[PDB]
């Protein structure tokens, strides 16, 4: 962050999680839109077990909305549109708990 | 029957909240309420 | 015009009018712990130049560790009373709330208030619920 004049953009772990449904994905979409609006940028998602881990079988037996946020982030990182000049840095202990997609 | 006569303060449930701030506010509100009159004694029942 | 800072509705910060009533003399002879907690919190704050002149970057976090009742909370109240900076005490139970995300929001807001109210000392007491291992949850 301190040596590169790109435009660092932070995101903690438990910060894209919002109680109201969908507000945990509109935030990610706005994040990437702001990044695209800001030219060369780098995002350092800090401990990312939060919006991560592995998809759990749904129902009333596990978390699902965090799963939708993870899906939104995944799609925006590599989806129908090819993001240009945006780079992401993800740091998180326990590499073996993340999902097979991220 | 003692020189209190002020007993009632129907149970105590409204002090339930989701943060300590609202509980402190309600408890000082009731404490001032008790301070309003002669020795006031607060029923605390109706808890689950 | 610009009005004074406001919006301190959820003000858990003591900031006078709720301070505990204990000096460093209602605690009975916890000499080693008293000295250590002082040198951890109180000393770095007043005699700041006493530290940089050695290149230390004083400690930023201290734990409490003892049997079920030994004065842990009492020394916390005492440090809070004999202090110059703010003090916010939030038990490690008001964090396990119902609506999802509303949990970590409380931590973020607590630290934001701490940073926005000058030097501060944050006390998380009885934090034994949310500290326990990893146990990668499959649930
Ligand atoms: N050495 C002591 N001096 C004065 N009071 C004490 C002492 N030890 C225990 N107490 C009283 O016993 C209580 C125990 O508090 P404490 O053990 O800190 O709570 P916790 O169970 O969270 O550790 C305190 O409120 C205090 O009033």
From Swiss-Prot, chain A:
Cellular compartments annotated: Cytoplasm; Nucleus
Domain of life: Eukaryota
Residue(s) carrying N6-acetyllysine: 19
Coiled coil (residue ranges): none
Subunit structure: Component of the 19S proteasome regulatory particle complex. The 26S proteasome consists of a 20S core particle (CP) and two 19S regulatory subunits (RP). The regulatory particle is made of a lid composed of 9 subunits, a base containing 6 ATPases including PSMC5 and few additional components. Component of a complex with USP49 and RUVBL1. Interacts with PRPF19. Interacts with TRIM5. Interacts with NDC80. Interacts with PAAF1. Interacts, in vitro, with the thyroid hormone receptor (in a thyroid hormone T3-dependent manner) and with retinoid X receptor (RXR). Interacts with ERCC6.
Function: Component of the 26S proteasome, a multiprotein complex involved in the ATP-dependent degradation of ubiquitinated proteins. This complex plays a key role in the maintenance of protein homeostasis by removing misfolded or damaged proteins, which could impair cellular functions, and by removing proteins whose functions are no longer required. Therefore, the proteasome participates in numerous cellular processes, including cell cycle progression, apoptosis, or DNA damage repair.
Family: Belongs to the AAA ATPase family.
Protein name: 26S proteasome regulatory subunit 8
Source organism of this protein record: Homo sapiens
Organism phylogeny: Eukaryota, Metazoa, Chordata, Craniata, Vertebrata
Gene of this entry: PSMC5
Shown part of the complete sequence: 204 to 305 of 406
Curated annotation (Swiss-Prot), chain C:
Protein localization: Cytoplasm; Nucleus
Keyword Cytoplasm (UniProt): yes
Alphabetical GO biological process terms: blastocyst development; proteasome-mediated ubiquitin-dependent protein catabolic process; proteolysis
Keywords: Acetylation, ATP-binding, Cytoplasm, Nucleotide-binding, Nucleus, Phosphoprotein, Proteasome
Highest taxon listed in the record's lineage: Eukaryota
GO MF annotation terms: ATP binding; ATP hydrolysis activity; proteasome-activating activity
Presence of the UniProt keyword Chloroplast in the record: no
GO cellular component: ciliary basal body; cytosol; membrane; nucleoplasm; nucleus; proteasome accessory complex; proteasome complex; proteasome regulatory particle, base subcomplex
Binding site for ATP: 66-73
Disulfide bonds: none
Oligomeric and partner information: Component of the 19S proteasome regulatory particle complex. The 26S proteasome consists of a 20S core particle (CP) and two 19S regulatory subunits (RP). The regulatory particle is made of a lid composed of 9 subunits, a base containing 6 ATPases including PSMC4 and few additional components. Interacts with NR1I3. Interacts with PAAF1. Interacts with TRIM5. Interacts with ZFAND1.
Role description: Component of the 26S proteasome, a multiprotein complex involved in the ATP-dependent degradation of ubiquitinated proteins. This complex plays a key role in the maintenance of protein homeostasis by removing misfolded or damaged proteins, which could impair cellular functions, and by removing proteins whose functions are no longer required. Therefore, the proteasome participates in numerous cellular processes, including cell cycle progression, apoptosis, or DNA damage repair.
Family per record: Belongs to the AAA ATPase family.
The protein's name in its UniProt record: 26S proteasome regulatory subunit 6B
Protein source organism: Homo sapiens (Human)
Gene that this polypeptide is encoded by: PSMC4
Residues of the full protein shown: 141 to 279 of 418
């Amino acid at each position: 962050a301190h040596h590169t004049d790109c435009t660092f953009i932070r995101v903690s772990g438990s910060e894209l999680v919002q109680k109201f449904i969908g507000e945990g994905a509109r935030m990610v979409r706005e994040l990437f839109v702001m990044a695209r609006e800001h030219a060369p940028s780098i995002i350092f998602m800090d401990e990312i077990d939060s919006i991560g881990s592995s998809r759990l079988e749904g129902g009333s037996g596990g978390d699902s909305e965090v799963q939708r946020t993870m899906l939104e982030l995944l799609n925006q990182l590599d989806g129908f549109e090819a993001t240009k000049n945006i780079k992401v840095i993800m740091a998180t202990n326990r590499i073996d708990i993340l999902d097979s997609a991220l | 029957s003692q020189l209190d006569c002020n007993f009632l303060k129907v149970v105590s449930s409204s002090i339930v909240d989701k943060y300590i701030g609202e509980s402190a506010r309600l408890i000082r509100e009731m404490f001032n309420y008790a301070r309003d009159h002669q020795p006031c004694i607060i029923f605390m029942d109706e808890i689950d | 015009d610009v009005l004074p800072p406001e919006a301190d509705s959820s003000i858990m910060m003591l900031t006078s009018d709720q301070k505990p009533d204990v000096m460093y003399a209602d605690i009975g002879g916890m000499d080693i712990q008293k000295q250590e907690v002082r040198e951890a919190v109180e000393l770095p704050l007043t005699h700041f130049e006493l530290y940089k002149q050695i290149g230390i970057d004083p400690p930023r976090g201290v734990l409490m560790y003892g049997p079920p009742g030994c004065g842990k909370t009492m020394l916390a109240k005492a440090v809070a009373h004999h202090t110059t900076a703010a003090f916010i005490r939030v038990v490690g139970s008001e964090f396990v709330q119902k609506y999802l995300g509303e949990g970590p929001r409380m931590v973020r807001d607590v630290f934001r208030l701490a940073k926005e109210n000058a030097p501060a000392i944050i006390f998380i007491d009885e934090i034994d619920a949310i500290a326990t291992k990893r146990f990668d949850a499959q649930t």
